Design a binder for this molecule. Structure first.
Ligand SMILES: Nc1ncnc2c1ncn2[C@@H]1O[C@H](COP(=O)(O)OP(=O)(O)OP(=O)(O)O)[C@@H](O)[C@H]1O
Ligand SMILES: Nc1ncnc2c1ncn2[C@@H]1O[C@H](COP(=O)(O)OP(=O)(O)O)[C@@H](O)[C@H]1O
Ligand SMILES: [Mg+2]
Ligand SMILES: [Mg+2]
Lengths: 551, 570
């Protein structure tokens, strides 16, 4: 399969800086394996000494070599496991940071078409099951490679003749597994079909029991369920019979080698080319290789089966954004003018149904406008185009004889901010949420901008400070239902153009933000949107919106 | 569990034979290390060669007999557990259908099926595998310990003393490992909740252009996590060290004490070879036994949850005991008031009074939402009257047998249902025995299915899906009327029978109801909104809501100038 090769190569390149940890883990794994396969060789040395002339100098020296290899192998295995689980957590933190940093630069078509629950599952839970692919597979693979080479190297040193007797029956185990797994996969298909037929009766009887009870045929569904159970029973017995027969064949074939290995062992050691402890070292060594060669032969199938979970994470990171090309502007002096002509904007999510038709209007430094529309006519849709939140699919928005797409990401949004019907309050303190979007220099500006609406009575009454915590959304905000906090956030950054989507309203008594009260000092433009046609105080331009059209 | 053990009581003969064959197989399996020791000692003692031709033959016969008896014992245990699983699934199915219809409510379709199909099979599969492995390795662990006492009396005391040292320390340091991993997992979930909260308000974030603030807020939680898992890697390094030093130092102590014991003259060197080969087999036998135990411990508690569900008791009466001949068929309704058991605080039906005399027609018409379909469900034994008397030939419905009564009273629903079988079987569904081929055609001709199914190439043996993809709305009502007519019931109830049924079938159902001589032996009740069907009805009832407003014949109701004329002219 060529589909999993590109994903494996990208996943291998994700662990580039953890190469020194992988080298030290491989070095500690080799030393731990070498310590493990050397104690049974020394075990045959003690039995060799015990069956002859006893001398306490070599017997104590042999035991001292057991202890030195025991502390060495346990320390090498202990430091290997700790290093592998440190790489697993360091890999997990890298992919999680790279995913969210890539996801933050995506268009808003991705955050409304896809549910936020799906993104939470691919960021919190899926990357944990994806990070542990490499430390688990590299530990299993590098253990079986060294140990098989290490044990078979110890085979040839003891007896090259007796090694080949156990080296020429491994095809029998492989041929037994190959012929058994094919028959086991055929029977499992039949079991799934029979258990689907058994569930078919329960779909019929339970769902429509009103018809069954009204005709007195409840015993018919009981009798019909017995036929479905008997067919599942017979297939279960055939599955258990073929499994038990395979275990009998494998155990007999394993026994016949051991009887043959021992029979040649007694004949060779009688003549004088082997000792008693050499046979014990050979017997302990030979039982270890049987399980580890079976893990080695079936590691590639397990590795590719477990790797099929990184497709969703890698597609979210590497997908192409829909944002246009940014650029530079002239931030020296701003004339504070906005021009608009021939808008035919439609949402990229729903291009078939338009929202705004051809309209033109202008904003002046010494004037304030008003937008009135009943419902669904593009009340906040026009406000989304001015702040470069959405790009038009027909026509363009101008700002002093140049469009808005070539403006930079920072200075355009610092000069144009807006407030809406749902002012989202983020986690943190009041001071952190008042001056959100500002890098610094808020410690000398919050106290003069938070008193815009009605001075301070909601915050001043308790804790005598701005450092009162808020929490999540749906919190203890009572300053005009978290509206006073949002407008005071807007006047912190002293923007040139302010858009008020659903301001004033019942709080129109607080009218210190619409007229000269905020604007008209120097040059400043304010756009007001109201649902009901209220008389605009000190009006300069009146605009009424109806289905994307104005008078 | 006592009742789970008492469920497996008839298989005591097979369970006794299985325990014997396991013991005989485990005794014969431990033959190769036990015969390695003597043969190696026999060469080093320079013994005779008249035993080598026989000792290898004996040792090969024993383990061959141990391999076959393992296969025979595993064959019996897999056969008996299969019959137990098939028996348990059948009996838990029959207990489900014995409950009242209140328990279902057309909303427990998912939870009931997960309790009958999914859980039962997974519970029996966990029991049949874990108990088999626990019984196989307990005997092997006991047999090895029995023979390790024979080979030595000092070395077998050493490995029993240090056995709790092997399998108690790794558990304790392991408890320190996920105690710290709980805080790492908790901090991982808290960091993801901050990033999700900052991402769901993306138009607010994009309007203010503060992605760097969210990148720094995400990075602060990751640096606190990076501090915590460094202690996690240290904790596993200690945990992985102490499970490997105790295992290998145990072999050193066994060999050194054996080295002291052999040189004293107690046992020979070859007896130490058997004891070395018994250490690795006994250690893995204990280790497999300890890993099995959490599986059976959890599965026993799950089986106690199913067993408590098995003895759920219903609220309806079970059945009756009287089977008469020459049934009258008249059913009397006397002061019947019914309330739904779902919401007993609100009354939905009260004050019914009529009589369905045999041979006449009694049809009730009401507006939408008047609650007439619950009256027809009350006619049979689907529900029970709360404070009324339902009289059928001088006796109530629970006094009659469940199988006999529903064979005598047949009804169709407002929305008929079709079961996924042959249409010949679905016509004769619910019958005790299958009738002849002519009687199905006679019932289908009267219902009208023969005028359409003759054109189908499959005849009367067409196979239909689970719910109404092959049969149309007219065909579904056509096969529903034949189903209620094959048994020749004594009381026939029709609910919206001609709502979508075709005009030729609305024709020949009218001479069947009004002109055919088969109406003399039945009493019919219709709940239909069609004004072209109740002209020859002998009794007409009006159900505006709750109770009967007025009733009478055709001419009396028009002369009365009531609400019946106003609904007719509309
Ligand atoms: N299982 C139930 N438990 C409680 N209330 C129910 C149940 N099923 C239905 N209901 C409610 O009780 C009412 C009883 O009216 P009923 O079902 O007898 O009328 P219907 O004859 O089917 O209606 P229509 O006027 O459409 O012909 C239903 O309309 C419904 O609102
Ligand atoms: N998030 C959205 N995605 C797609 N279409 C939208 C969205 N919000 C509004 N619309 C569509 O745009 C039209 C105009 O909405 P608009 O008047 O701007 O809403 P509001 O009155 O809240 O400002 C509506 O008919 C609506 O169907
Ligand atoms: Mg709006
Ligand atoms: Mg109805």
């Amino acid at each position: 399969q060529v589909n999993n090769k590109v994903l494996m190569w990208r996943l291998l390149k994700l662990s580039r800086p953890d190469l020194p940890l992988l080298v030290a883990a491989f070095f500690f794994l080799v030393l731990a394996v070498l310590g493990e396969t050397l104690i049974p060789h020394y075990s045959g040395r003690v039995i060799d000494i015990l069956g002859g002339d006893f001398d306490p100098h070599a017997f104590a020296s042999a035991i001292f070599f057991m202890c030195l290899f025991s502390f060495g192998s346990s320390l090498s295995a202990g430091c290997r496991g700790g290093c592998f689980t440190y790489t697993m957590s360091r890999i997990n933190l890298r992919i999680r940071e790279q995913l969210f940093s890539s996801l933050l630069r995506q268009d808003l078509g991705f955050f409304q078409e896809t549910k936020t629950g799906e993104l939470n599952s691919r960021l919190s839970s899926d990357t944990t099951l994806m990070s542990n692919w490499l430390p688990l597979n590299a530990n299993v693979l590098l253990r079986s490679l060294v140990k098989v080479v290490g044990l078979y190297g110890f085979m040839l040193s003891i007896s090259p003749r007796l090694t080949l007797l156990s080296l020429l029956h491994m095809p029998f185990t492989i041929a037994a597994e190959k012929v058994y797994n094919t028959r086991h996969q055929e029977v499992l298909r039949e079991i799934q079909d029979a258990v689907a037929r058994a569930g078919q009766v329960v779909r019929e009887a339970v769902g429509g029991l009103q018809t069954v009870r009204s005709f007195g045929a409840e015993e018919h569904e009981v009798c019909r369920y017995k036929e479905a159970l008997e067919q599942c029973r017979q297939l279960y017995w055939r599955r258990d019979l073929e499994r038990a027969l395979y275990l009998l064949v494998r155990r007999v074939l394993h026994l016949g080698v051991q009887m043959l290995m021992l029979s040649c062992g007694l004949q060779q050691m009688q003549d004088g080319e082997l000792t008693q402890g050499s046979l014990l070292s050979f017997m302990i060594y030979q039982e270890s290789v049987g399980s580890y060669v079976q893990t080695l032969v079936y590691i590639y199938g397990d590795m590719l089966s477990n790797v099929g979970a990184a497709e969703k994470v890698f597609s979210y990171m590497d997908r192409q954004p829909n944002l246009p090309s940014p650029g530079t502007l002239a931030p020296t002096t701003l004339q504070g003018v906005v021009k608009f002509q021939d808008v035919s904007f439609a949402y990229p999510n729903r291009p078939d149904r338009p929202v705004l038709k051809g309209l033109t209007f202008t904003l002046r430094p010494g004037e304030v406008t008003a937008l009135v529309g009943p419902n669904g006519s593009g009340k906040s849709t026009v406000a989304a185009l001015l702040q470069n939140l959405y790009q038009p699919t027909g026509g363009q928005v101008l700002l002093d004889e140049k469009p808005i797409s070539q403006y930079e990401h920072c200075y355009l949004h610092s000069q144009v901010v807006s407030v809406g019907q749902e002012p989202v309050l983020f986690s943190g303190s009041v001071r952190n949420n008042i001056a959100y979007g500002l890098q610094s220099c808020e410690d000398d500006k919050v106290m003069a901008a938070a008193q815009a609406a009605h001075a301070d009575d909601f915050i001043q009454e308790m804790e005598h400070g701005i450092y009162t915590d808020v929490g999540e959304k749906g919190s203890q905000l009572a300053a005009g239902q978290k509206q006073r906090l949002a407008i005071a956030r807007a006047l912190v950054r002293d923007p040139r153009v302010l858009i008020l989507d659903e301001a004033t309203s019942a709080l129109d008594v607080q009218c210190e933000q619409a007229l000269q009260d905020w604007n008209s000092r120097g040059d400043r433009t304010v756009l007001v949107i109201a649902h009901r046609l209220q008389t605009v105080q000190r009006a300069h331009q009146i605009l009424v919106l109806q289905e994307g059209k104005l008078q | 569990v006592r009742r789970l053990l008492g469920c497996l009581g008839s298989e005591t003969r097979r369970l006794s034979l299985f325990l014997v064959l396991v013991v005989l197989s485990s005794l014969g399996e431990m033959a190769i290390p036990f015969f390695t020791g003597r043969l190696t000692d026999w060469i080093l003692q320079d013994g005779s060669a008249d035993t080598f031709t026989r000792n290898l033959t004996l040792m090969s016969i024993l383990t061959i007999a141990s391999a076959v008896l393992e296969f025979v014992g595993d064959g019996i245990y897999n056969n008996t557990m299969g019959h137990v699983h098939s028996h348990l699934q059948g009996e838990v199915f029959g207990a489900v259908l014995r409950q009242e219809t209140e328990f279902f409510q057309q909303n427990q379709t998912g939870n009931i099926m997960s309790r009958v199909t999914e859980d039962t099979s997974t519970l029996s599969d966990s029991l049949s595998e874990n108990l088999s492995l626990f019984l196989w390795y307990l005997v092997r662990g006991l047999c090895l310990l029995g023979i390790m006492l024979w080979g030595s009396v000092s070395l077998t005391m050493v490995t029993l003393i240090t056995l709790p040292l092997l399998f108690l320390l790794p558990k304790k340091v392991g408890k320190w490992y996920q105690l710290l991993e709980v805080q790492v997992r908790e901090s991982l979930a808290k960091s993801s909740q901050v990033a999700i909260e900052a991402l769901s308000a993306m138009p607010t974030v994009r309007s203010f252009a503060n992605e760097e603030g969210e990148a720094q807020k995400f990075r602060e939680k990751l640096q606190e996590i990076k501090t915590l898992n460094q202690k996690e890697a240290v904790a596993y390094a200690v945990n992985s060290w102490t499970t490997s030093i105790s295992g290998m130092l145990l072999k050193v102590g066994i060999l050194y004490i054996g080295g002291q014991l052999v040189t004293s003259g107690a046992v020979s060197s070859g007896n130490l070879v058997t004891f070395v080969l018994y250490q690795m087999q006994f250690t893995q036998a204990v280790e497999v036994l300890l890993s099995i135990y959490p599986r059976v411990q959890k599965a026993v508690g799950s089986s106690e949850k199913i067993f408590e569900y098995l003895d759920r008791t219903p609220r309806c009466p079970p059945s009756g005991l009287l089977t008469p001949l020459h049934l009258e068929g008249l059913v009397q309704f006397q002061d019947v008031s019914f309330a739904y058991p779902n919401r007993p605080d609100v009354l939905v039906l009260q004050g019914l009074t009529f009589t369905l005399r045999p041979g006449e027609v009694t049809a009730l018409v009401g507006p939408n939402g008047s609650g007439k379909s619950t009256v027809a469900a009350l006619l049979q034994n689907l529900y029970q009257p709360t404070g009324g008397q339902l009289l059928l030939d001088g006796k109530p419905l629970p006094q009659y047998e469940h199988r006999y009564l529903h064979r005598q009273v047949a009804a169709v629903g407002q929305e008929p249902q079709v079961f996924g079988r042959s249409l010949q079987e679905n016509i004769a569904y619910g019958l005790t025995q299958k009738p002849t081929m002519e009687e199905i055609t006679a019932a289908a001709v009267k219902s009208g299915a023969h005028s359409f199914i003759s054109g189908l190439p499959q005849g009367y043996d067409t196979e239909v899906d689970e719910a109404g993809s092959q049969l149309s709305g007219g065909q579904r009502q056509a096969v529903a009327l034949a189903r209620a007519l094959i048994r020749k019931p004594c009381v026939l109830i029709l609910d919206d029978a001609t709502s979508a049924l075709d005009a030729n079938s609305q024709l020949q159902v009218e001479q069947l109801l009004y002109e055919s001589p088969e109406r003399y032996s039945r009493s019919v009740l219709l709940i239909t909104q069609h004004l072209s069907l109740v002209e020859q009805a002998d009794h007409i009832l009006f159900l505006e809501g709750g109770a009967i407003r007025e009733g009478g014949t055709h001419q009396q109701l028009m002369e009365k100038k009531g609400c019946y004329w106003a609904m007719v002219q509309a």
